[PDB]
Write a protein that binds this ligand. Structure first.
Ligand SMILES: [Fe+3]
Ligand SMILES: [Fe+3]
Length: 296
């Protein structure tokens, strides 16, 4: 579709999509000899993303930054496998995201979920320890001076997860929004909410993101780049779709429907029977509905 760029390769003068559009890694060209990556993908894509990267970057020591929106397994799975191959990279993540990588139990969930995505054929590259990643914690509101033409602000955007941040390039009216708006369903053309931590924070984050200067490019954690009206109206539409889901929940609960019943229905109606993102399955759908039920 015209308003959505969802193919691997070049997306803008400074911007490329690496790997699988469902779990993409974005490549920013910061200068003649300087690059950044945005989003951290899934572990099993290490060699695919590496192969794509080397088509654009002849010298991987020129990759200087890796920006991470949140701790979910599908947004940091590549780090232990590709960081050893990027000797100059600095991983930029929020305080709470960095904390997840020094938690034994959290690292265990991330690795189990990523291992489930391995094909029987493949073996992962040699990994460095999660607590040995070259990370620099970034704070809410901090300006990331990545290069002479790349200045991105860190914006706290909790609610999808308790650590989630977004990255705003105001020069380009470009927002890397992770999962904070949900999952864009390219079938129906609408956002599907992904409220896995706190509904009030998720909605509050979307209110603040609507107050940004009008977006030209909106780049979520899954599905590629959105432009035109999809970017300009994205945060508002995601807010609307979350309220719409709340109302549907309260409607059907008050007709005696159990959450498991509605979890099944919604999972079906959104296409769950590799269409939905890996993080939106019956169990996590059930978790989101639980969260919305409690906060309403
Ligand atoms: Fe997520
Ligand atoms: Fe995700």
């Amino acid at each position: 579709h015209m308003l959505r760029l969802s193919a691997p390769g070049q997306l803008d003068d400074d911007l490329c999509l690496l790997g699988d559009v469902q779990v993409p890694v974005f490549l920013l060209r910061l200068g003649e000899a300087s690059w950044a990556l945005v989003e951290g993908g899934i572990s099993r894509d290490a060699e695919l993303v590496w192969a794509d990267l080397c088509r654009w970057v002849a010298d991987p020591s020129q990759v200087h930054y890796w920006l991470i929106t949140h701790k979910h397994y599908d947004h940091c799975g590549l780090l232990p496998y590709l960081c050893p191959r990027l000797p100059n990279v600095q991983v930029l993540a929020s305080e709470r995201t960095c904390q997840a990588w020094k938690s034994e139990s959290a690292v265990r969930v991330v690795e189990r979920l990523n291992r489930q995505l391995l094909r029987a054929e493949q073996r992962l590259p040699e990994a460095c320890a999660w607590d040995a990643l070259p990370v620099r914690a970034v704070a809410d509101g901090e300006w990331l001076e990545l290069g002479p033409r790349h200045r991105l602000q860190v914006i706290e955007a909790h609610g999808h997860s308790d650590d989630h941040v977004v990255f705003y390039d105001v020069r380009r009216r470009r927002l890397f929004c992770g999962d904070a708006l949900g999952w864009f369903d390219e079938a129906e053309g609408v956002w599907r909410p992904l409220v896995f931590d706190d509904m009030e924070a998720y909605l509050e984050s979307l209110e603040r993101l609507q107050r940004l200067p009008t977006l030209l490019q909106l780049i979520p954690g899954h599905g590629g780049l959105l432009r035109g009206r999809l970017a300009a109206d994205g945060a508002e539409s995601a807010y609307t779709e979350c309220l719409r889901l709340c109302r549907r929940l309260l409607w059907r609960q008050s007709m005696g429907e159990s959450l498991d019943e509605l979890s099944e229905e919604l999972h079906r109606a959104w296409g769950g029977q590799d269409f939905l993102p890996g993080e939106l399955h019956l169990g996590s759908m059930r978790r989101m509905l639980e969260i919305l039920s409690r906060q309403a």
